[PDB]
Amino acid sequence: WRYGGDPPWPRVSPACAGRFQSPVDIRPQLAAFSPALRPLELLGFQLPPLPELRLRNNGHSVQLTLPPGLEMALGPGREYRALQLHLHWGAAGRPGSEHTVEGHRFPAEIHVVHLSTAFARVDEALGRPGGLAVLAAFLEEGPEENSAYEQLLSRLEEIAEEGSETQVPGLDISALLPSDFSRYFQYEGSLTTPPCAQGVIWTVFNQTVMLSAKQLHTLSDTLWGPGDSRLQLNFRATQPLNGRVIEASFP
Ligand SMILES: NS(=O)(=O)c1ccc(-c2cn(-c3cccc4ccccc34)nn2)s1
Ligand SMILES: [Zn+2]
């Protein structure tokens, strides 16, 4: 499968034609305030430098493989383990976040993908309710170089070619996320690429993460994808809520 052309995704996976897909346009007036949504909790995200982690240009994103022992809870009894994180982005003067807010597309987006502790493997969790959970944050332009992001972004030249990878020292993985874990939207949807399985719990932070202009340019102008093409605009069009109500942890 690829962005911007064939094969049609429903042909690759029928779940890509499900009614309840991601990403979506968050319209926060239509979000439902839900006070049972408590602050997200993360354990083990502050990693030592060794052992190193694998960072891969997979042709459709840059993906960092996370080690065992990263625990995430969406709430009491809602427990997950982190598997990997990756990015979606646009191109020169074109934003490429997956989620939008009142139609606004942000420069880029981070996803940290998690497996429910009830499942040993992703393929057993696929399509099961709450089997997979993704934390999502928008990346915007700020004045300073983001030091946590610089650790990944400084290595993209090494993985410019589709299918290449490199090793990077462990870092504080939670430093790639906003510090505000209290304010977020949450809805049930799908993986945003094939196999587009449903049952995925999406949590989208209110607060954004700040990268420098240079960093955002590095992300969008360094990697190459399928064929002789730049890896850019690697986001799926927003999908209709189709009756789903997005919850918000705030009024
Ligand atoms: N953009 S996204 O976060 O929604 C996303 C899209 C696809 C993802 C994905 C695929 N994964 C898989 C990993 C390992 C084995 C798998 C086996 C079957 C299907 C997906 C698998 N895990 N996340 S995460
Ligand atoms: Zn993603």
From Swiss-Prot:
UniProt EC number: 4.2.1.1
Parent-record interval covered: 141 to 391 of 459
Membrane topology: Single-pass type I membrane protein
An MF annotation (GO) of this entry: carbonate dehydratase activity
Biological role: Catalyzes the interconversion between carbon dioxide and water and the dissociated ions of carbonic acid (i.e. bicarbonate and hydrogen ions).
Extracellular side: 1-251
Record protein name field: Carbonic anhydrase 9
Tissue expression profile of the protein: Expressed primarily in carcinoma cells lines. Expression is restricted to very few normal tissues and the most abundant expression is found in the epithelial cells of gastric mucosa.
Subunit structure and binding partners: Forms oligomers linked by disulfide bonds.
Record's note on what induces expression: By hypoxia.
Claim: Transit peptide is one of the keywords in the record: no
GO cellular component annotations of the record: basolateral plasma membrane; membrane; microvillus membrane; nucleolus; plasma membrane
Known catalytic reactions: hydrogencarbonate + H(+) = CO2 + H2O
Family per record: Belongs to the alpha-carbonic anhydrase family.
Biological process (GO), any one: response to xenobiotic stimulus
First-listed, main subcellular location of the protein, grouped into a coarse class: nucleus
UniProt-annotated glycosylation sites, renumbered to this chain: 206
Region (Catalytic): 1-251
Activity modulation comment: Inhibited by coumarins, saccharin, sulfonamide derivatives such as acetazolamide (AZA) and Foscarnet (phosphonoformate trisodium salt).
Domain Alpha-carbonic anhydrase: 1-250
Superkingdom field: Eukaryota
Binding site for substrate: 192-193
Post-translational modification: Asn-206 bears high-mannose type glycan structures.
Active-site residue list: 60
Gene: CA9
